[PDB]
Design a protein around this nucleic acid. Structure first.
Lengths: 226, 158, 155, 314
RNA sequence: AUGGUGAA
RNA sequence: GUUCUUUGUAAAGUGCCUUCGAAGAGUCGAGUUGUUUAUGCAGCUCUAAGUGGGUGGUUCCAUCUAAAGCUAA
RNA sequence: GUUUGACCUCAAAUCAGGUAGGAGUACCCGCUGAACUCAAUAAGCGGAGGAAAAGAAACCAACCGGGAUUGCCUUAGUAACGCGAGUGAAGCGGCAAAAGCUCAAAUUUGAAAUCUGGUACCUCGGUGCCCGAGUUGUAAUUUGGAGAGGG
């Protein structure tokens, strides 16, 4: 059994999310056609363009328990970021640019750093393959030398360079990396964890805010937070 | 204030509500020891009009006395005997039974610094008031002594 | 057997309406000692170096709550069921009904006091509020004051 | 002598806190009464009781509500224990040889529910100071490249600490609670040890540090045998860890340029690939030279040649 | 009579 | 006497205009049973009023506000 | 969400801060109380101080009003009783001394403004901080002589 309030809240949130998605898609369709005559804006900007740029994305929980919507759910499935606290590197492009707005409410994006990328790669990594359910970590470069390296990506440093330098094998390595499941912030409950979570939740509102405007600038935050 | 209504409610003791309350509380009182501490007064209006206050240092006791000397004075003396370091300022009725009578007694601690530090009650800390109930100087004691108002050998040098 | 005047409690507000009432009361929690002290210190510092709208808070003290009652200043009255001296609250529902003021009963005096800082509050009331108060009053009426208007019966 | 349960009951402290107290002090056989009596007089018991009271009051506030009270409620180091277990600084340096292995292992562990991110950050930062200090006094004397890791041996005033550097590969994850207490104690010791070492080195402490360089490599290249590789500059290929090679060269007094810096006196280039296009040398040459000060020419470590038998230098 | 003393 | 402080839209009194405006319950009382120097107290059933009540003597009048408490001489 | 904390109650401490026993007992305050109406005497019991107790009228008064309590003279060996043995006062009058008063009682609600304990300073205490008591009522404002709000 479930109380009435939950269903009504879920319906209200789903309606708003669907309306925002429809408006954004309709505006982007006209923007792509280049008519730009009776729309709010035609240009794009970021405040704190569609030029190439490697960015890190983290799947955040919330908003309220909205039923999986087709557009955003499919977009996340393309990046396989369904699980919370999961992140993956994607090559920014003009075609991929509207995807940010499409899945802006569910994810946070920003510009990573070479040190951060190196630390993340050398500290976490998955290779889900040979029954092949094993989640073997990047223990040794032998797997990288065998399965990978056809394009010259023989060691983990090569993967780091490809990810940071957007090499040809960026697509191959990124799929092979089985993007990492980052640990949640509080990761606890009980006497101290409740207060710590409550204190941390306040920063979420001031950091993870959605203006819902069709021409809202791309939301960007430094990846140095984690 | 609630006391204005509480006094009137307590006036009609024969009323159904108070009759039920007394018979409910009699068993609980009986299950308790002969003398036991009371966290709060069951008749706050009576205690407050008797000069009792909820501030620190005030203690409410209850004691059971056989029916059939004045019962109030005997109860005060009995509570004072066990409560040697406390002073029995006053006592009042709360419940009666066929075989026993229950009287609530309010105690004031003279050693507590809170009682000594206020001018409204520091007088009780004087040694003259020690064992006030023993000498029958309380309200019940004075009434028993017959201190009412009205009709109710020597040889000089020359 | 309990007399008809007693047992009016124990039969209390429903779960959902009680939760809504608690949530509404939490919106007007009185300033605590620490918050009041820090606000006063800040005001003193501002004045010492280099005029506000009237505040609002829930009413809880029995004496002043009853003082507001009878004067018709109490928009809503919330009463605890587990109060040890029953006589303190036996007459309160009757007074509220006579004065024509909405009233409700809850289970747990400590839960009543948790929303007003104090350990226990016995009863609580509100003087001013934004607009959900009318809806809550109507719900409380239709769920307790009119549905259980036969409290004078039974034993 | 009294039983462990009897001692716990006498101290009326849960076994979880008794473990921390014993680790800080050290008690073992069944147990001598005198040790328990001495422990009971420690001030740490009062702090533990205060922490328990704080936790229970916080739980009370959270259950009652008014989160402001819980936030306002938020308002120690085992310095005394350090003196007891380490009567003198040389004793602390002696105990370092086995104590700091836990800290160095924790420096590369991943964040999880069992270990807060703050602990890992502190462990990593402690390495940034340890390596920085070791690269100024040039006390490195051994560089055994073991399977467990590069077995460093810094001659810290003649005690030859046997600290081991774990590999940079992901250390996939035992009761970490005891490990957490050991890490906390070792970090408390490290604070004072690093303070003393920096004061002895003559550098103002804490000195300035560079964060832009940290964002590039994040390691020893920040925060500002010895005769080997004087003024030498080596280029590191994409198949070697800069964190290890750069530290040794800097201690020797040379310089290192990272290939991934954008991800002259270039006497040598460290390369391991079978295909190459500077004096190309395998990484084994640097380790062999440092282990004994041979300063052997590059002819004995050309890339692609058979590796020599590297006997353990102990 | 009051209050104590002791004994087969 | 001598002094360092005197303070903050702080406190009190008095006459004028105006509006408001409480009182100690198993208690007084009553009947009985024991005590008392025909007062009072005690055990007990009953136990109430607030232009109300307690004490008195002349056709119903005079005074006071009890059932809480402190206080040198 | 079968986990939890509150509130209420019941226990424990070689825990911290506190107090009663006993003695003296002429005087004082209550209980009990014997015999040659004797006598509310003696003994016994419990409790205190330098005095104790009482003390500011639900008093006496029938006046042209007095006006906290207690002692002396007088009232008076009178009223009254047992008219019989014996008991036996009180108002008024004069003398020595005089003092007032505090809570329940009506909203501090535009701010529990109150206070105990622990800690750091200068110490028959004061300041900051922390906890606890407190709303089932802690401060000022009102105790019938009335009293409160305002101009």
């Amino acid at each position: 059994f479930v109380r009435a309030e939950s269903i009504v809240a879920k319906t209200l949130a789903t309606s708003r999310e669907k309306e925002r998605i429809k408006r954004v898609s309709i505006l982007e369709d006209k923007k792509a056609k280049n008519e730009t005559q009776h729309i709010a804006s035609g240009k794009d900007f970021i405040l704190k363009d569609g030029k190439p740029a490697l960015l890190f994305i983290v799947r955040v929980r919330g908003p309220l328990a909205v039923n999986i919507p087709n557009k955003a759910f499919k977009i996340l499935s393309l990046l396989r970021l369904v699980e919370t606290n999961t992140g993956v590197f994607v090559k920014l492009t003009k075609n991929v640019y509207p995807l940010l707005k499409v899945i802006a409410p569910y994810v946070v994006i920003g510009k990573p750093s070479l040190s951060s990328i190196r630390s993340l790669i050398q500290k976490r990594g998955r290779i889900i393959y040979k029954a092949e359910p094993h989640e073997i970590v990047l223990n040794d470069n032998n797997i990288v030398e065998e399965q990978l390296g056809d394009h010259g990506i023989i060691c983990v440093e090569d993967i780091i360079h490809e990810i940071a330098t957007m090499g040809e094998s960026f697509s191959v390595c990124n799929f092979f990396l089985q993007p990492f499941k980052l640990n949640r912030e509080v990761s606890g409950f009980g006497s101290l964890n409740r207060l710590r979570k409550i204190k941390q939740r306040e920063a979420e509102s001031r950091t993870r805010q959605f203006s819902n405007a069709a021409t809202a600038p791309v939301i960007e935050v430094d990846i140095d937070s984690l | 204030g609630a006391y204005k209504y509480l006094e009137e409610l307590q006036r009609k003791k024969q009323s159904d509500v108070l009759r039920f309350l007394q018979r409910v509380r009699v068993w609980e009182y009986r299950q308790k020891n002969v003398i036991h501490r009371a966290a709060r007064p069951t008749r706050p209006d009576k205690a407050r009009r008797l000069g009792y206050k909820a501030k620190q240092g005030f203690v409410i006791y209850r004691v059971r006395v056989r029916r059939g000397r004045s019962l109030r004075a005997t109860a005060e003396e009995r509570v004072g005997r066990r409560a040697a370091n406390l002073r029995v300022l006053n006592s009042y009725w709360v419940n009666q039974d066929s075989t026993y009578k229950y009287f609530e007694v309010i105690l004031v601690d003279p050693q507590h610094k809170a009682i000594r530090r206020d001018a409204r009650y520091n007088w009780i800390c004087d040694p003259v008031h020690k064992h006030r109930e023993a000498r029958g100087l309380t309200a019940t004691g004075k009434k028993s002594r017959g201190i009412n108002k009205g009709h109710k050998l020597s040889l000089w040098r020359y | 057997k309990v007399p008809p005047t007693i047992a009016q409690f124990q039969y209390t507000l429903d779960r959902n309406t009680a939760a809504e009432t608690f949530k509404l009361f939490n919106k007007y929690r009185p300033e605590t000692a620490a918050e009041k002290k820090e606000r006063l210190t800040k005001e003193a510092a501002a004045v010492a170096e280099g005029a506000s709208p009237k505040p609002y808070a829930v009413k809880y003290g029995l004496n002043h709550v009853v003082a507001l009652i009878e004067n018709k200043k109490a928009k809503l009255v919330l009463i605890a069921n587990d109060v040890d001296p029953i006589e303190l609250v036996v007459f309160l529902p009757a007074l509220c009904k006579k004065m024509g003021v909405p009233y409700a009963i809850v289970k747990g005096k400590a839960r009543l006091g948790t929303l007003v800082n104090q350990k226990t509050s016995a009863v609580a009331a509100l003087t001013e509020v934004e607009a959900a108060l009318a809806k809550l009053v109507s719900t409380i009426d239709a769920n307790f004051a009119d549905k259980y208007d036969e409290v004078k019966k039974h034993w | 002598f009294i039983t462990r349960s009897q001692a716990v009951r006498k101290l009326q402290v849960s076994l979880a806190d008794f473990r921390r107290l014993c680790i800080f002090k050290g008690i073992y056989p069944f147990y001598y009464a005198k040790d328990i009596q001495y422990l009971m007089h420690e001030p740490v018991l009062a702090k533990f009781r205060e922490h328990k009271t704080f936790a229970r009051k916080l739980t009370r506030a959270l259950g009652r509500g008014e989160v402001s009270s819980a936030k306002r409620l938020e308002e120690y180091t085992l310095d005394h224990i350090i003196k007891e277990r380490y009567p003198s600084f040389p004793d602390a340096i002696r105990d370092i040889d086995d104590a700091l292995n836990m800290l160095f292992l924790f420096s590369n562990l991943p964040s999880t529910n069992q270990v807060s991110s703050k602990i890992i950050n502190d462990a990593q930062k402690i390495c940034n100071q340890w390596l920085a200090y070791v690269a100024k006094e040039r006390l490195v004397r051994k560089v055994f490249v073991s399977i467990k890791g590069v077995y460093y041996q810094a001659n810290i005033k003649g005690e030859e600490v046997r600290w081991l550097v774990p590999f940079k590969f992901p250390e996939n994850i035992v009761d970490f609670r005891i490990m957490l207490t050991f890490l906390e104690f070792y970090s408390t010791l490290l604070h004072f040890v690093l303070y003393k070492l920096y004061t002895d080195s003559g550098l103002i402490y804490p000195p300035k540090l560079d964060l832009k360089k940290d964002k590039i490599i994040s390691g020893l290249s920040s925060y500002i045998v010895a005769s080997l590789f004087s003024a030498f500059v080596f280029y590191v290929s994409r198949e070697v860890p800069i964190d290890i090679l750069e530290f040794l060269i800097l201690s020797c007094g040379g310089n290192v340029i990272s290939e991934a810096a954008m991800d002259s006196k270039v006497t040598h280039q460290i390369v391991d690939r079978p295909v190459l296009k500077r004096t190309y040398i395998q990484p084994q040459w640097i380790f062999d030279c440092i282990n004994k000060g041979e300063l052997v020419p590059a002819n004995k470590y050309l890339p692609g040649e058979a590796l020599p038998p590297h006997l353990s230098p102990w």
